[PDB]
Structures are given as C-alpha cells and as structure tokens.
Amino acid sequence: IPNTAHFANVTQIEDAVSLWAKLKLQKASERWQPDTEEEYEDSSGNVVNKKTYEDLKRQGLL
Amino acid sequence: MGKDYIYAVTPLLEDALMDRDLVHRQTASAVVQHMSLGVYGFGCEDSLNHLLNYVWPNVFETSPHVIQAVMGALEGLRVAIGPCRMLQYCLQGLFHPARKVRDVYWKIYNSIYIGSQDALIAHYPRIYNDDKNTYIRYELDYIL
C-alpha cells in the first residue's frame, strides 16, 4: 500500500488494509471506465458496452 | 481615496505582518482595519484577501492590545471583504479538540454574526442529516 497520507497515524496493519480496501473501492468507483460505462448499440436495435461491442465486432460480426 | 495607494502600501504591511515584534503586528493590523473601511465598495478585495492571509495567524494571541487590534482588523475586513470569506476562515475551528482555539473562533464568529447575521443565510455550509434529525435545507434546493 503506498505511503500516501490517507493512512498516516493508522499503525495497525489490518486496519490499514481495510482502510485502503474501501479507499481502493472508492478510487475504482470514481474512475470513469469506458469499458463498462461507454456503451454501444449493435445494428440490431439492442445495446452492449464498448468492450463487448468490439469483442463481437472483431471476432466476425460487427 | 485610498483606492489609489492600497497597492503601494500592501507589500509594506505584509512585510511587517511577517514578524518584527508585537507592536509591529499590532500596528500593521490597525492599518489594515482603516484601509478596509476606506476601500469599502471599490473592488480592491484581492488586496485585502492577501492581507487576511497574513493577519489571521495572529488570531491566537494573548497580549490585550495585540489581539484587540487583530479583532478590529477583522471587523473592518468583514465589511470590506464580505462575510462569506470570513465565515470560511472561521469554519474549521468552531468544533476543534482544543478549547483555546474553540474559544477564539467562537469569539470571532459571534462578532461576524451580530453584524450581518442576515447575509450568512446564503453562506452556511451543507450539513448532512443523520438518523433522527433533519439538517439539510430542502427549502433552498427546490428547483424552479
């Protein structure tokens, strides 16, 4: 776990890991990830994400 | 007609608010008080902000004259700079562990409150509501 300030004065390691655990969760939350957010309709009037769109796109349909 | 020489004088007051002595900071504070009451309404608020940065640290003080000229500087600066800026300076130390700092911030906030208690209504923070109380003000965030 990096030596960022957020844990300074937390000295016990299980506390540190659960702290940085929720911190990790929050950083991943507030990240905008185009894979799951950025979303694509196929031609067929139904929608998928960026990832799956390119997946089935370049494995030979879209 | 201080709206002219306020710029010329600032770097000398910041010079003497970074320590030189008790009396040095007592007197630079008096100067800030009177500049603020003169330049009320002419837009030279960036300069008085800059000098707030230097006066506010003297808030924890003991000598009667020194802390008194400081408090005077903050009333002058309150009319001249507005009560948002000074409520923000006074936010974090209202509920501090200590008691010397709690007491100085409640002294200030009292004087900020007595005069101009009615602006503050649009300057208070957003203070979330826990279980058995309601603390948000939904009145203010009706859309329209």
């Binding site: 300030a5 957020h6 004065n9 702290l19 | 608010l17 902000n49 924890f60 974090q92 562990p97």
Partner: protein, 250 residues
C-alpha cells in the same frame, strides 16, 4: 469519571477514516473532538482554510523567528525608479557627520530647500507605473517558514531552467525550445520514461520547436524516433473560441 465513558465513545482513527466519505482530512487529535463527524465534514468542505500549524507547539509561533538576522525591507521598483532612496541616503550621511553645535546652528539658520525632486516623477510612479504585486489567493495562511517554500514541483516535462541547461550541457534562453536536452536523446533512442508516458519530448516525440534543425551533429534534432513503417515513436516527432470580452473600454 463521567468523561471515562465518552472517552470510550472516543472512536478509533480507523473508525473515522472508514466511516467518513472523504478520508484525506482525518488527523491525529480529530478524535478527542466532541463532534468528529461534523469536524470532518467541515474540514472536507470546499474552499475552507485549516487552522494554523502552531497551536500544538510548545515552541512559540513567532518567538521562533527570534534567532536569525534579517535584511531591511526592499522597496517597490516604481518607487526606486523615482530616485528617492539616493536623496535620503545623502541627507543621512550629511546629518550623521554634522556635530551638535552645527546642528543647532542649522536649527537657527536653516538650509532651506537643500534638495528638490520633481512632481510628475512621483505622480507618474504612483499613477502611471504602479503595478500588481504578487498576491496569494484564499486560504494560504502564512506560518513560520511559509515564505521559505519556493516554487518548484514543475512536473510538466518541458520545465527547464537556465542553470539546468548550463550544468547539463543544453542552451539557455530562446534556444531552450530549439535545444532538445540530453535526455530527449535517449528518449528518441529507447523511449521517454515509462511513468511519464503522458509526457512527449520536444524534437523526440513532439514536433520541431520553433525553427529547429534536423541533423546528426551537435545542435540538431536527429532522427525523430519512428517505426520501420514510418509511424513515429509516439505523437508526432516530426509534426504533421473567440475570447473577446463583452464590456471593455476603448
């Protein structure tokens, strides 16, 4: 005592940091405060300004400036320009040399109008060359040593200094553009550093700085790093609205 139980309410710093929505704030003594959920929401509000450092200290806030020696105040340029300081230095040296008897003799028979300094010199300083000093925006309280912190942490790659150029072998001045530093050389050679892959090097991953020179001697841009198929190492190492104010005076 009665406190002995509110002290058992006195939660853990991990209790706090996990509860809170913004964990950067949580500090040491935060917990002995009568209302830490408030205190932390406040300290995490926008634009607010934290208590000084020095309420803890047993070392006095200014009395710590006690020790050193300090140089006298330095006037504003536009006031030096008008040449007051030399008038005053001269008068000083005069009256430090003169003796008591001559002092009172000049008291009784004054040197009326010894000197002069013309207006429009003053009035033009104060009304024609007066300029905005450097100010600090909301929040940045001065503390003992606040001024000592010096503008650095220039993380936007391109940040170069003139002594840096000299003691690294590169040029200072208008040639800080057309001078690719000795690190852009191995940027072109094996790549720019893989924690500044969001940094492009000028002349190595960026285009020619204004009027740069391609060539392989000392003083040029060399081979802009490119693939064997022609696409550069990144970006373009070779190189291939209406902000008018509405109310403004004529």
């Amino acid at each position: 005592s009665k406190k002995k139980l509110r002290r058992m309410n006195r939660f853990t710093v991990a209790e706090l940091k996990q509860l809170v929505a913004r964990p950067d704030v949580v500090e040491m003594h935060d917990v002995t405060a009568q209302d830490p959920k408030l205190l932390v929401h406040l300290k995490a509000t926008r634009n607010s300004v934290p208590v000084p450092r020095h309420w803890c200290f047993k070392r006095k806030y200014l009395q710590g400036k006690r020790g050193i020696e300090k140089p006298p105040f330095e006037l504003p340029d536009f006031i030096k320009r008008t040449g007051i300081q030399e008038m005053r230095e001269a008068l000083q040296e005069k009256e430090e040399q003169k003796t008591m008897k001559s002092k009172m003799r000049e008291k009784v028979r004054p040197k009326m109008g010894k000197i002069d300094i013309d207006y429009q010199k003053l009035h033009d300083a104060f009304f024609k060359w007066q300029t905005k000093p450097k100010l600090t925006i909301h929040g940045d309280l001065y503390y003992e040593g606040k001024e000592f912190e010096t503008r650095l942490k220039e993380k936007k790659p391109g940040d170069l200094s003139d002594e840096l150029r000299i003691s690294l072998g590169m040029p200072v001045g208008p040639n800080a553009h057309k001078v690719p530093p000795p690190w852009l050389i191995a940027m072109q050679r094996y790549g720019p550093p893989p924690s500044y892959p969001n940094l492009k090097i000028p002349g190595l991953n960026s285009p020619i700085p204004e009027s740069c020179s391609f060539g392989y001697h000392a003083g040029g841009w060399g081979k802009p790093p490119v693939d064997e198929t022609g696409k550069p190492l990144y970006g373009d190492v070779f190189g291939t609205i209406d902000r008018t104010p509405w109310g403004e005076l004529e």
